[PDB]
């Protein structure tokens with residue numbers, strides 16, 4: 001039965017840990033957001049083809065340029081994440097995340113994941129960004145970023161509402177099969 | 178509330194890290210050193226390259242560090258001191274990270290399904306590679322938990338400040354050590 005190693009990369013502000021916890025528990029953790037998500041695996045059927053999905057977090061490693069790549073080899077598919085309400089995180093896809101992923105894993109599929117969709121239509125978030133002369137990242141921006149990097153899919157999701165979450169991981173798997 | 182949930186995670190995850198290293202040592206390492214199964218010639222007597230200094234790292238957490246974190250369970254504001262106290266022990270993550278690249282290649286080029294076989298055999302959800310990334314994960318995670326404590330601990334918080342300093346210095350030194 002096919003095993004799949006999936007590594008989730010991106011800035012601290014994407015909510016990597018939260019994404020994974022929320023996906024694996026089927027619930028936003030809510031009260032307390034844990035900082036630890038230990039390497040996980042579970043069986044899932046996709047297009048009626050059962051699969052062992054393995055998820056590795058990378059949170060904490062965001063300042064260690066030579067340590068992050070230790071997780072990269074033998075990865076079957078990457079989620080490269082940015083937050084939809086952090087233009088900086090989005091720009092870092094281009095500047096930081098895609099380069100090192102390609103450098104080390106030149107033929108591994110990438111899904112481009114836009115996180116915190118629950119905040120893109122939020123007055124206080126939008127206002128906090130307007131005050132920095134910024135706006136949230138919209139759909140065509142992600143599509144255009146995906147194209148630039150060779151992503152197989154650009155996908156939007158929220159850990160909070162779980163909108164698009166299951167689908168993110170469904171397509172991680174479809175990108176390998 | 179928040180300082181207490183963080184401290185509970187710190188401890189709960191420390192326990193699991195000790196369980197995880199232990200598993201690793203008593204399965205993947207043990208089979209190699211046991212003399213109970215067919216060891217590919219390419220990896221023979223090279224368990225020092227595969228597992229690096231993970232024995233020593235485990236001993237540190239299992240003999241000392243988890244025992245001492247437990248003592249700080251009702252003292253989250255002070256737990257930064259735990260890390261200062263044991264700062265020198267963490268230097269052994271520097272060594273481990275230096276060795277991880279060599280470890281990984283060796284397992285690709287020369288182990289075939291040896292370890293996959295043992296994984297299948299014991300019914301382990303984590304591959305040897307999954308176990309062997311954990312020290313690298315764990316040593317970058319301590320700085321996250323201390324930061325979280327800082328967001329919710331008062332003027333009594335230089336007993337986090339210096340802990341965090343150590344746990345930022347260790348990973349950077351490990352990171353700076355790579356070839």
Ligand SMILES: CCNC(=O)Nc1nccs1
Pocket residue numbers: 014015016018019115116117118119157158159160
């Ligand atoms: C409090 C804001 N809610 C989130 O944390 N949203 C996320 N979507 C994906 C990962 S974290």
